[PDB]
Design brief:
This is part of a larger assembly, with six copies of chain A. Chain A is mainly beta and about 220 residues long. Chain A is built from two helices and 16 strands. The PDB classes it as viral protein.
């Protein structure tokens, strides 16, 4: 994050430091039986593992899985919407598989600010972290390096999905379901009124930007010079 | 995930850190919009156990514990009215969950029912709902005796008027036009952005692995460059569309915040 | 003795599968309500051709495609036969063999694209005779052979409709199964437009 | 592709009437050819036999015949001789392979009859085939379809004796030729 | 070569000026709100709550 | 109105459709603006003679 922010000190916040895509292993190729007799090598298939695959000249990277959708006897591979291959039938065993893009998502750190401490809590967005101290699943992704607490406080760093993280005491980063506010039930009754008997006058600050810097770019001197 | 394309893209410059920065800006702006509109209550207000608000009936708009979502009947109706991870596109979840927003509105509603406009000013001071309605009639110019002499009739009118909203929402289609239009516009933008990939963009073929495979790297570089410039142009167009539409929705969200303040929290003399 | 080609006469464009989505395809199709030339001979092949035939006694036999059919240049000679269907580039009807292939209402669609011959067929339980009722069906059981010539003759060897495909976009609705339940013709009508 | 019925054909053909087999509508596993250890020569021109198992061709020809040892060197572009001029000629831009192996165990007994052409009024064009058995007129006087003075029968038999020298024993030759135009293809 | 450089630098300048226009629209909304506050809250007393 | 140019333009994609959609949205928005500003009265009122 110090690199992607171009600084040696980053303020308290959550910064999308990079992106994380599970890399494919043991790419596979398949081509129908060589019944009429150059030739094309073919190998066995896999399941539930992000793999680069070649099915009948169609190259793609994903997790192949069993699919309940039935093709018609002539259809080879299917596209659900927006011209994206979503299903494909293998030419050897005549079986339909569903393709899902193997997990990918932004990796963003949560830091309380450098001068406060050097601790960080990694958040891998929308990744069910069965794969790469305590690993806590949240509806906004996976949190690595942040203790989960049961009590709730006001939101400090917005993680997402109703969850915020903050640096608190020993001296750890904690993630919690943010508290909307204090709870009170004002005592209503059909013959009860609450009348103020005193008052406080209060001055508050409202800050509003009204202008920008009047920049002027010489088009020709910038483009050519 | 093509390395040679990665290098040819790298040589263009800082366009993508810029696009990511714009998108993350509008992303956090959305959370700011929701929080600004709904989080105007200091502390969530529970409504009293027995509802005897001077003959007025708030069962429809008040939260029902029986529902798992813990949102009011009309809110569930509105949710049902609308009908709301491919290649590099991700949709980040909103910071405030739908349940949290329902809780915000329940707090605001309980506060305005029990304490009138006092809770917006400061500490929530409770008045019997009839007397508060008399306050508000004094606000609009009608003397307060008009309410008390006609309290049952006014209660019946309010109850039947709330009843009409349920029919209007449940039966009349496209009641939630603006919100459905927002959803459709966002779906349209993402869909056309994904469709642009299939576009040839003047190269020999759209699919990048194929253009890599059947040409020499010196020649393939030019076709890959055409694909990159076209895709980058489409993505830049999507980002600028998002920026402008986010500005428009920010204006609407500011209007909603102002109406929440000036009308829910207090009575307003601004006609219409 | 013409007769309007009704809705029927649409085929699956490509191999792909689509579930409960509307798609737009741009290739040769048979126009909606286009008066096909019912024959009761000689037939040209300006472009891809929809051939639809009804025979109670299955009198009609295979199609003798040919660019010239003067024995000077290679023919296509689709024929069919109880045991098998035989098609050769080279019986009673006659007129450098390149390739031979043997394998196994009556909708038939034949088209030649970049030298590839494509066949689309369908079988229907017809109940009204002498009219093709407006309805929807398609399949792509085909045989591909790289001829690379522009066929211009049919000479089918008891009446068959024949219509000519044209390159106009269609909007095809897709069922949950992936079959093409319905379609509309873009340039047929302003409403369909 | 039927490379087996070309290479393991029980009987071959005389070089003057060389046999041509057109390969079409099939998948050719060329590895069977170059992984075999029973060939004397496997000269390919303008094409890599180890690199066409993921390649397609618009046209494939297979030419098989029988010659003798010192004549295998004539089955190549830009060659001259009895075989190259009067029997089988390859073009200068030949794209294909010349495969040959000794066939003394098959084409030599002490009962096959292999022939070759002696004379011709002009050299053969590439891939031309002359099977005419008309009397060659070498002089001014015209033959009357009969052999005589300055008149010779154009075909001779090979003297394939099992005790011949290596260069005089028979060699079976297969000539695969390829074409790759911007046109449909059926041999992959 | 100068054509490639011109096209790239022109695209960068164009996206810069477009983002500047959008940011200026945001600032104009903020300045109009500030003028409304200065007119309704400094030049007078405002009843519209919060 | 040149077909050779139009066929090349097809490759670029949905750019023309996007531009047409944006412009027609601006167009309908203008009518919405005038309607919102001026159509505040349910029924036309005539001043007495
Ligand atoms: C309405 O609210 C206002 C709040 O501002 C309130 O005025 C405050 O009254 C209290 C009570 O008198 C003041 O507190 C005292 O102020 C005197 C100075 O005048 C101090 O000397 C006092 O300190 C001594 O007493 C304390 C309590 O006994 C001890 O704890 C302490 O150690 C000292 O011995 C004490 O602070 C306060 O100053 C004012 N505030 C202001 C701003 O004037 C007002 O009374 C309320 N009105 C009603 C009707 O309730
Ligand atoms: C392809 O589309 C067809 C038609 O839309 C679907 O056919 C119908 O599917 C349902 C649910 O699968 C079937 O209901 C079940 O039928 C069985 C007997 O077939 C019955 O015992 C069950 O209690 C239930 O009612 C329905 O019958 C079936 N229609 C038929 C067979 O004519 C089909 O489901 C789609 N394909 C897939 C893979 O979903
Ligand atoms: C390709 O060859 C394989 C090899 O046998 C075939 O696989 C068999 O498929 C049948 C179909 O039900 C199964 O019962 C067998 O158990 C399979 N055997 C093996 C070893 O896989 C496959 O069907 C062939 N496909 C085609 C299109 O010919
Ligand atoms: C935080 O709250 C959760 C509520 O589920 C606690 O988890 C339960 O703990 C009790 C007592 O240890 C167990 O009997 C339950 O089986 C637990 N339920 C689940 C779903 O895990 C958790 O112990 C609490 N942690 C702290 C530190 O208070
Ligand atoms: C407030 O309105 C609700 C909604 O109509 C009332 O609840 C219904 O009352 C009727 C009696 O007329 C019952 O038959 C329904 O089952 C009730 N529920 C619904 C969902 O309709 C409620 O009674 C009203 N408040 C008071 C105090 O009567
Ligand atoms: C029906 O068609 C088949 C074509 O396959 C005919 O049988 C062929 O006859 C030729 C001529 O002897 C053979 O070379 C083929 O091997 C045969 N093929 C098959 C599949 O048998 C047959 O004569 C035709 N007529 C009938 C009555 O079967
Ligand atoms: C941050 O830490 C530095 C010491 O490294 C300290 O001087 C500074 O006051 C700190 N900032 C704040 C806001 O406390
Ligand atoms: C994550 O995956 C594991 C196994 O694949 C599964 O048991 C678990 O329920 C999943 N959790 C989520 C939140 O997807
Ligand atoms: C004979 O067929 C072959 C292809 O099988 C073709 O290349 C050749 O030109 C044909 N001959 C004539 C005279 O058309
Ligand atoms: C038949 O010929 C093939 C070449 O096509 C060769 O590889 C094989 O060994 C031969 N069969 C024998 C020798 O049994």
């Amino acid at each position: 994050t110090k690199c992607t922010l171009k600084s040696f000190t980053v303020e308290k916040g959550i910064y999308q430091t990079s992106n994380f895509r599970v890399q494919p292993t043991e790419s596979i190729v398949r081509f129908p039986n060589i019944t009429n007799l150059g030739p094309k090598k073919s190998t066995n298939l896999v399941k539930n593992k992000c793999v680069n695959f070649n099915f009948n000249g169609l190259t793609g990277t994903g997790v192949l899985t069993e699919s309940n959708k039935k093709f018609l006897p002539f259809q080879q591979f299917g596209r659900d919407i927006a011209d994206t291959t979503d299903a494909v039938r293998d030419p050897q065993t005549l079986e339909i598989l569903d393709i899902t893009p193997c997990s990918f998502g932004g990796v963003s750190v949560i830091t309380p600010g450098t001068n406060t401490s050097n601790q960080v809590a990694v958040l891998y967005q929308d990744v069910n972290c069965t794969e790469v101290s305590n690993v806590f699943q949240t509806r906004a992704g996976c949190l690595i390096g942040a203790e989960h607490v049961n009590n709730s406080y006001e939101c400090d760093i917005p993680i997402g999905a109703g969850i915020c993280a903050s640096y608190q005491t020993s001296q750890s980063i904690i993630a919690y379901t943010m508290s909307l506010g204090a709870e009170n039930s004002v005592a209503y009754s059909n013959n009860s009124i609450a009348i103020p008997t005193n008052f406080t006058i209060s001055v508050t600050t409202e800050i509003l930007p009204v202008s920008m810097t009047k920049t002027s770019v010489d088009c020709t001197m910038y483009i050519c010079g | 995930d093509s390395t040679e394309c990665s290098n040819l893209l790298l040589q263009y410059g800082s366009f993508c850190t810029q696009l990511n920065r714009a998108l993350t800006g509008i992303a956090v702006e959305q959370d700011k919009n929701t929080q600004e509109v709904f989080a105007q209550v200091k502390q969530i207000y529970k409504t009293p156990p027995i509802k005897d608000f001077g003959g007025f009936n708030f069962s429809q708009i008040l939260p029902d514990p029986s529902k798992p979502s813990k949102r009011s009947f009309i809110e569930d109706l509105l949710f049902n009215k609308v009908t709301l991870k491919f290649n590099g596109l991700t949709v980040l979840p909103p910071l405030l969950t739908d349940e949290m927003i329902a809780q915000y509105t329940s707090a605001l509603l309980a506060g305005t029912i029990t304490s009138g406009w006092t809770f917006g000013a400061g500490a929530a001071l409770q008045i019997p709902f009839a007397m508060q309605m008399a306050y508000r009639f004094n606000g609009i110019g009608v003397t307060q005796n008009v309410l008390y002499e006609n309290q049952k009739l006014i209660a019946n009118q309010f109850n039947s008027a709330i009843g009409k909203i349920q029919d209007s929402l449940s039966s009349t289609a496209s009641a939630l036009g603006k919100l459905q239009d927002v959803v459709n516009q966002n779906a349209q933008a993402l869909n056309t952005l994904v469709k642009q990939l299939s576009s040839n963009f003047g190269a020999i073929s759209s699919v990048l692995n194929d253009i890599l495979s059947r040409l020499d790297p010196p020649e393939a570089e030019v076709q890959i460059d055409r694909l990159i410039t076209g895709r980058l142009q489409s993505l830049q167009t999507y980002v600028t569309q998002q920026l402008i539409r986010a500005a428009e929705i920010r204006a609407s969200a500011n209007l909603a915040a102002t109406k929440m303040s000036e009308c829910v929290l207090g009575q307003s003399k601004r006609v219409d | 003795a013409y007769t309007n080609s009704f809705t029927r006469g649409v085929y699956y464009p490509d191999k792909v599968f689509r579930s409960s989505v509307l798609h737009s395809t741009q290739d040769l199709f048979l126009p909606f309500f286009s008066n096909v030339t019912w024959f009761h001979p000689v037939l040209p092949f300006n472009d891809g051709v929809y051939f639809a035939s009804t025979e109670k006694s299955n009198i009609i036999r295979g199609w003798i495609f040919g660019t010239t059919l003067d024995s000077k240049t290679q023919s296509l000679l689709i024929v069919n036969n109880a045991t098998n269907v035989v098609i050769k580039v080279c019986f009673r009807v006659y007129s450098n063999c390149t390739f031979e292939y043997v394998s196994q209402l009556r909708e038939f669609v034949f088209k030649n694209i970049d030298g590839y011959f494509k066949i689309y067929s369908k079988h229907t339980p017809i109940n009204l005779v002498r009219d093709l009722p407006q309805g929807f069906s398609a399949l792509e059981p085909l045989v591909d052979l790289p001829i690379g010539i522009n066929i211009t003759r049919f000479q089918t060897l008891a009446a068959y409709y024949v219509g000519y495909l044209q390159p106009r976009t269609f909007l095809l609705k897709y069922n949950e199964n992936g079959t093409i339940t319905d379609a509309v013709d873009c340039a047929l009508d302003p409403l369909s437009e | 592709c039927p490379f087996g019925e070309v290479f393991n054909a029980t009987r071959f053909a005389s070089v003057y009437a060389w046999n041509r087999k057109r390969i079409s509508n099939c998948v050719a596993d060329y590895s069977v050819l170059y992984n075999s250890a029973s060939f004397s020569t496997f000269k390919c021109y303008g094409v890599s036999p180890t690199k066409l198992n993921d390649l397609c061709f618009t046209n494939v020809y297979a030419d098989s015949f029988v010659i003798r040892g010192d004549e295998v060197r004539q089955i190549a572009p830009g060659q001259t001789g009895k075989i190259a001029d009067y029997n089988y000629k390859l073009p200068d831009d030949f794209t294909g392979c010349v495969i040959a192996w000794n066939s003394n165990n098959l084409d030599s007994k002490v009962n096959y009859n292999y022939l070759y052409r002696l004379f011709r009024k002009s050299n053969l064009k590439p891939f031309e085939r002359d099977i005419s058995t008309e009397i060659y007129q070498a002089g001014s006087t015209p033959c009357n379809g009969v052999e005589g003075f300055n008149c010779y029968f154009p075909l001779q038999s090979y003297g394939f004796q099992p005790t011949n020298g290596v260069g005089y024993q028979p060699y079976r030759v297969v000539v695969l030729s390829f074409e790759l135009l911007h046109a449909p293809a059926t041999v992959c």
